[PDB]
Design a protein around this ligand. Structure first.
Ligand SMILES: CC(=O)N[C@@H](Cc1cc(F)cc(F)c1)[C@H](O)CNC1(c2cccc(-n3cccn3)c2)CCCCC1
Length: 375
């Protein structure tokens, strides 16, 4: 009964997506941020100027202490706190209650965001990357272990944003066309292999190794599409040239300055589509997902009569991160059971008059695992 789970997510633009959760007995209600880019369940357990409420272990009859501290750094923010267990539930999700590890956050730096609305984080990636070590069963593993909930989940994230997390199944009412699956290369991050990249139908013609150096992952926790140095540079060059008719600051191409045009006069057609071809389920076979400018140019609210945008492709140097920006076009299936991620066109796709984000296959592509990086 997946309908009870549709629209169970909210967020502000750029500040990630959250699902309502309860902890303890009596139930305590938090907003938890939904992260496929880490493996730890953490909640704020102490005052903070950005926290509107928090978790008070004392008042939970079912708290149990593990007497271990923990520390977790993210790309920018970080937090430390104390590890206990407790009972946990998702009001707008499957009907079960599980005993799960919880990091009680005691102090924190650049983690909570002002007017964030979320109070904790739900790392949905794999034990291998759990902190402090991989013996700390991540929330979702516990759920699968303790219940009958199938080892599968899906995220439909949409363009004051919202979306849905379908726990334990796929909801056909949320996509169109065909699901295409790409193998999970290794169960740590949701790691995948990008085999070909085209901007406006022109191949970047790099060794496909450069697409997955040092990895390529699907990460709801990151907003942007983030590309290795070399790939980022070629991409930018090609987008500078497809839209050289207009001119911008340079902070812009670095995600610093905004750029502006008058309401409705936003010149979409001058920005190229990006196609990322992912490894397929069948030998020599791939598929593509095509990104619209509407995704890689996030809006920002001014501050007044102009529509204004940040460039949402940034540099990386820990590999390619398909952030929310990539994920917004698509219904994304995390088929843990079959070590694959499926992509279909989202029901809440965002519609240019002349061009459209697509999941398309099949393609032929040779020596595809020459594309994976090795240390
Ligand atoms: C923006 C941000 O940083 N998002 C957090 C989620 C997030 C969202 C947010 F809004 C504020 C935050 F502080 C953190 C997300 O996991 C980051 N995910 C990566 C990451 C980066 C740094 C550490 C870890 N990691 C931690 C444990 C295991 N791996 C993971 C995954 C590897 C590739 C780079 C991004």
């Amino acid at each position: 009964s997946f309908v009870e789970m549709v629209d169970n997510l909210r967020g502000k633009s750029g500040q990630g997506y959250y699902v309502e959760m309860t902890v303890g007995s009596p139930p305590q209600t938090l907003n938890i941020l939904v992260d496929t880019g880490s493996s730890n369940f953490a909640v704020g357990a102490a005052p903070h100027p950005f926290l509107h409420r928090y978790y008070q272990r004392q008042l939970s009859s079912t708290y149990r202490d593990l007497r271990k501290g923990v520390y977790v750094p993210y790309t920018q923010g970080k937090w430390e706190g104390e590890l206990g267990t407790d009972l946990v539930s998702i009001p707008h999700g499957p009907n079960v209650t599980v005993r799960a590890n919880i990091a009680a956050i005691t102090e924190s730096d650049k983690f909570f965001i002002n007017g964030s609305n979320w109070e904790g984080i739900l790392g949905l990636a794999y034990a291998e990357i759990a902190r402090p070590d991989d013996s700390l069963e991540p929330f979702f593993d516990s759920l699968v272990k303790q219940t009958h909930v199938p080892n599968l989940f899906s995220l439909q994230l949409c363009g004051s944003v919202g979306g849905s997390m379908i726990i334990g199944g796929i909801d056909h009412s949320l996509y169109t066309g065909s699901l295409w699956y790409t193998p999970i290369r290794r169960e740590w991050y949701y790691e995948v292999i990008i085999v070909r990249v085209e901007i406006n139908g022109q191949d970047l013609k790099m060794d496909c190794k450069e697409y997955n150096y040092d990895k390529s992952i699907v990460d709801s926790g990151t907003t942007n599409l983030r590309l290795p140095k070399k790939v980022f540079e070629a991409a930018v060059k090609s987008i500078k040239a497809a839209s050289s008719t207009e001119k911008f600051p340079d902070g812009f191409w670095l995600g610093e300055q905004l750029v502006c045009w008058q309401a409705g006069t936003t010149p979409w057609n001058i920005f190229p589509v990006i196609s990322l071809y992912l490894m397929g389920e069948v030998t020599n076979q791939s598929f593509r997902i095509t990104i619209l400018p509407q995704q890689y140019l996030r809006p920002v609210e001014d501050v007044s009569q102009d529509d204004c945008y940040k460039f949402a492709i940034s540099q990386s140097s820990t590999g390619t991160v398909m952030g929310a920006v990539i994920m917004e076009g698509f219904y994304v299936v995390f088929d843990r059971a079959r070590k694959r991620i499926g992509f279909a066109v989202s029901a809440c796709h965002v519609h240019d008059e002349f061009r459209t984000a697509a999941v398309e296959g099949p393609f032929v592509t040779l020596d595809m695992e020459d594309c994976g990086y090795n240390i």
